[PDB]
Amino acid sequence: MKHHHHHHHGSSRSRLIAQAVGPATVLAMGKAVPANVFEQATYPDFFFNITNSNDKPALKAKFQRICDKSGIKKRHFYLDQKILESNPAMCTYMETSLNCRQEIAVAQVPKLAKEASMNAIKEWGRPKSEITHIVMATTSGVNMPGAELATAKLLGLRPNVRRVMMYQQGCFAGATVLRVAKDLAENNAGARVLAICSEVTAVTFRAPSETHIDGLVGSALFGDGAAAVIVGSDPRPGIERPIYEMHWAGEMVLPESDGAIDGHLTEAGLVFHLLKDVPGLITKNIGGFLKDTKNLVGASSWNELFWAVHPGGPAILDQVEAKLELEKGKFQASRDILSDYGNMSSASVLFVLDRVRERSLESNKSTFGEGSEWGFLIGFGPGLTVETLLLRALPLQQA
Amino acid sequence: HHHGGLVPRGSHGGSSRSRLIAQAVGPATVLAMGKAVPANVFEQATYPDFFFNITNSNDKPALKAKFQRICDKSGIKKRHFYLDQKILESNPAMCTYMETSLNCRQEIAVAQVPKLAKEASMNAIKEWGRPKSEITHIVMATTSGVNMPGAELATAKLLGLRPNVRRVMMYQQGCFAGATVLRVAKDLAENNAGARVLAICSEVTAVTFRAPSETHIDGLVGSALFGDGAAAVIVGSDPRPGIERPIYEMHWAGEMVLPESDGAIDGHLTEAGLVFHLLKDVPGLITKNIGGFLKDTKNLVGASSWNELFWAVHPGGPAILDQVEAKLELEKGKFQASRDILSDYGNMSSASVLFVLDRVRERSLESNKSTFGEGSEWGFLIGFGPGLTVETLLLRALPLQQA
Numbered sequence: 001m002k003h004h005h006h007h008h009h010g011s012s013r014s015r016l017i018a019q020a021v022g023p024a025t026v027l028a029m030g031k032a033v034p035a036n037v038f039e040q041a042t043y044p045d046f047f048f049n050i051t052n053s054n055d056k057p058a059l060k061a062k063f064q065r066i067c068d069k070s071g072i073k074k075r076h077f078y079l080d081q082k083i084l085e086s087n088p089a090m091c092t093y094m095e096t097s098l099n100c101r102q103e104i105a106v107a108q109v110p111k112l113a114k115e116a117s118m119n120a121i122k123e124w125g126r127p128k129s130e131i132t133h134i135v136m137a138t139t140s141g142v143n144m145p146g147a148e149l150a151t152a153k154l155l156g157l158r159p160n161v162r163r164v165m166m167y168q169q170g171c172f173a174g175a176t177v178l179r180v181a182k183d184l185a186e187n188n189a190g191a192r193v194l195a196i197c198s199e200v201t202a203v204t205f206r207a208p209s210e211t212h213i214d215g216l217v218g219s220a221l222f223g224d225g226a227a228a229v230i231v232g233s234d235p236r237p238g239i240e241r242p243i244y245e246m247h248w249a250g251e252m253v254l255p256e257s258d259g260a261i262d263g264h265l266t267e268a269g270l271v272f273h274l275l276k277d278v279p280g281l282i283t284k285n286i287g288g289f290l291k292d293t294k295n296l297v298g299a300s301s302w303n304e305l306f307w308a309v310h311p312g313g314p315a316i317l318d319q320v321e322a323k324l325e326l327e328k329g330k331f332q333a334s335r336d337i338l339s340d341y342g343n344m345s346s347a348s349v350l351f352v353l354d355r356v357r358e359r360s361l362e363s364n365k366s367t368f369g370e371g372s373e374w375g376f377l378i379g380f381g382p383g384l385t386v387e388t389l390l391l392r393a394l395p396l397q398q399a
Numbered sequence: 400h401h402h403g404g405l406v407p408r409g410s411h412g413g414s415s416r417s418r419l420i421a422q423a424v425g426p427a428t429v430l431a432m433g434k435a436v437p438a439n440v441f442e443q444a445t446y447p448d449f450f451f452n453i454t455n456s457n458d459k460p461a462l463k464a465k466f467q468r469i470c471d472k473s474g475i476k477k478r479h480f481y482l483d484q485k486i487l488e489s490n491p492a493m494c495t496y497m498e499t500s501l502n503c504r505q506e507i508a509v510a511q512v513p514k515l516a517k518e519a520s521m522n523a524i525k526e527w528g529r530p531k532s533e534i535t536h537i538v539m540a541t542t543s544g545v546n547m548p549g550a551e552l553a554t555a556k557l558l559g560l561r562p563n564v565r566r567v568m569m570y571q572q573g574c575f576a577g578a579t580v581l582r583v584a585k586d587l588a589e590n591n592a593g594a595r596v597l598a599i600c601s602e603v604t605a606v607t608f609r610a611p612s613e614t615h616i617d618g619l620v621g622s623a624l625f626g627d628g629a630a631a632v633i634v635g636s637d638p639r640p641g642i643e644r645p646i647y648e649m650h651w652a653g654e655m656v657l658p659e660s661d662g663a664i665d666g667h668l669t670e671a672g673l674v675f676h677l678l679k680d681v682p683g684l685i686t687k688n689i690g691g692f693l694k695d696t697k698n699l700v701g702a703s704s705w706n707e708l709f710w711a712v713h714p715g716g717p718a719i720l721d722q723v724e725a726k727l728e729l730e731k732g733k734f735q736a737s738r739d740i741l742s743d744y745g746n747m748s749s750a751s752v753l754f755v756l757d758r759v760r761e762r763s764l765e766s767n768k769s770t771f772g773e774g775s776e777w778g779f780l781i782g783f784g785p786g787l788t789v790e791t792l793l794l795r796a797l798p799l800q801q802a
């Protein structure tokens with residue numbers, strides 16, 4: 001260790017560098033979606049036209065039916081007429097097309113992530129140089145260097161930012177980035193984590209086929225979007241304001257769910273195959289999984305909690321709601337996102353959490369959790385994994 | 400604790416200034432290390448013959464002579480591969496330069512990665528000596544293929560870990576992931592009381608194997624270095640006396656993207672598999688910046704000479720070892736563990752550096768050294784890869800009984 005013009009000559013057993021004291025907290029949230037808006041009502045027309053499937057009326061009627069019951073009003077896509085016409089392979093069913101899909105995704109994911117991040121950083125109000133870690137997830141393509149570095153570069157973060165990139169995880173990654181951010185923020189004094197999820201449909205988009213019904217469901221639900229969250233423990237008075245506190249983060253693989261959802265990255269892009277009743281498996285096991293955690297804070301009723309659930313589709317929301325006998329308004333934030341954005345994979349649940357904060361603000365509620373002190377952020381996906389975080393919502397001033 | 404359980408909504412430890420679930424007290428420690436490699440042994444001396452035969456490139460004698468010179472100076476004596484003549488003959492597309500073959504490669508890698516990871520994990524668990532049910536988290540990385548569900552769940556199932564194990568899967572990261580899984584394990588272990596993390600790196604070459612090309616020399620070099628292998632480390636804070644024994648303590652984990660290193664290393668996952676492009680002198684960039692990156696940490700621990708520390712450096716070829724060694728003026732013994740691994744296994748991507756750390760421990764034991772760091776108290780574990788990212792962990796080696 002140098003001192004002035006001379007020198008002097010650390011922690012044997014104990015830790016050389018200190019950890020934080022308080023629980024990790026959500027300090028800000030931001031989001032972004034591409035410019036092209038596609039109304040669900042007439043999406044079948046565009047879809048069957050661009051994929052040259054107009055001579056398949058029965059299949060189109062099937063897709064229209066799926067779209068009509070999707071609970072989705074509109075979706076945002078980077079993909080448009082021009083891009084798809086310039087990439088005919090992507091408009092076929094299974095023709096070799098990974099290279100053109102990767103070219104699109106590798107560029108769009110970090111771009112959308114940067115916008116969501118800037119929105120979060122703007123609400124946060126602190127210099128981007130204070131960001132010490134970046135944690136990111138996407139199921140839209142893979143590259144080396146990863147999308148997290150591409151994003152950090154677009155944002156102009158410090159060269160020594162600690163990174164965690166989690167590619168190809170699926171619909172439960174929204175909860176995953178927060179679980180990872182929680183430990184990074186809590187175990188490092190002063191740490192401020194930028195947690196991101198960015199998804200684009202370039203890798204999954206493909207022509208409809210009666211030989212791939214699962215593909216029909218995906219083409220009706222998946223949309224584009226990115227969300228960013230600033231996470232940190234020990235908020236500084238005056239310049240930072242906690243919205244939620246993270247107190248528990250866990251997950252589990254559901255019994256008898258092997259093969260429920262398989263995702264294969266192939267020469268033709270990403271293809272999903274479903275084998276079991278996902279909504280059923282989740283509904284049957286969700287209660288037992290959550291019970292233990294609720295008990296940690298003495299919560300007895302499901303309705304005393306607020307919910308930020310991944311809007312995988314209308315079926316999962318309806319069945320869980322019924323199973324837990326929740327008041328109609330408990331899942332409204334989730335339904336609001338499904339309606340305005342569709343299923344944006346991992347970023348969806350983050351959009352839902354921001355919406356919970358939004359509804360609390362506009363409805364003059366006593367907390368950021370629409371009036372409830374404790375709540376669950378839930379994500380689910382492949383392996384039939386259910387991820388969950390127990391959040392405590394901070395007080396919100398009322399009129 | 401329930402504290403009687405009469406007022407659970409108020410007696411729990413969760414508040415704006417306290418936590419519901421306790422974190423650990425001490426630094427995360429390496430409690431055990433295990434490794435595994437596939438059965439097929441390919442001698443480097445004659446790899447060129449096999450390679451040019453299987454890729455049908457015998458009509459390129461000049462390119463072969465060039466490959467032979469690369470293999471002869473690679474610092475590698477042998478490598479272990481899952482791939483063999485039979486498998487490659489059953490997958491002709493993989494024996495070409497750039498013909499569509501991703502689906503062939505994916506089928507092979509998806510099954511092999513978790514299998515090798517399971518073997519490595521079982522060895523680490525066996526050394527640790529505790530019930531596998533005590534594993535609370537699994538952190539894994541691989542650059543060999545991608546699947547949904549991921550390799551970490553596939554590995555957890557093969558191992559029979561608890562259904563609620565917390566997972567972190569990091570696909571397609573590259574050669575620095577060995578340090579990465581440890582940096583992640585460090586935070587998970589230290590922030591959760593009782594947590595025991597299984598950190599894994601498993602790599603197979605099915606996705607990168609391909610025919611040599613006169614237009615892709617950096618690619619030819621890769622074909623001489625990449626081998627298969629998996630390593631697993633059990634990480635946990637507050638070791639339990641009598642049933643656990645700390646080998647190394649982790650005290651710092653950092654990383655940085657080197658200046659002027661854009662495009663230094665690009666890895667593209669294509670219809671023809673994973674293709675690497677090295678546009679800059681990798682060892683040069685690392686050698687030029689490594690000193691300044693570690694300087695402050697080195698001074699923090701009270702070391703004035705780089706020789707006062709032990710080392711576990713990713714053996715990404717012989718040049719990085721030679722150049723950094725010269726730059727930091729290290730005695731030949733400092734990088735010997737790294738050279739031993741390069742010699743016996745080649746470059747196993749992310750798992751390599753973990754093999755090296757295990758080797759440092761082994762050399763300490765066989766040489767009657769005073770610590771698990773071959774006599775030194777502090778040391779650096781270093782990995783590097785794409786985005787010219789350098790990852791490093793500061794480790795403290797525990798004392799070792801001497802005869």
Ligand code: NI
Nearest residue numbers: 003006007008
């Ligand atoms: Ni002084």
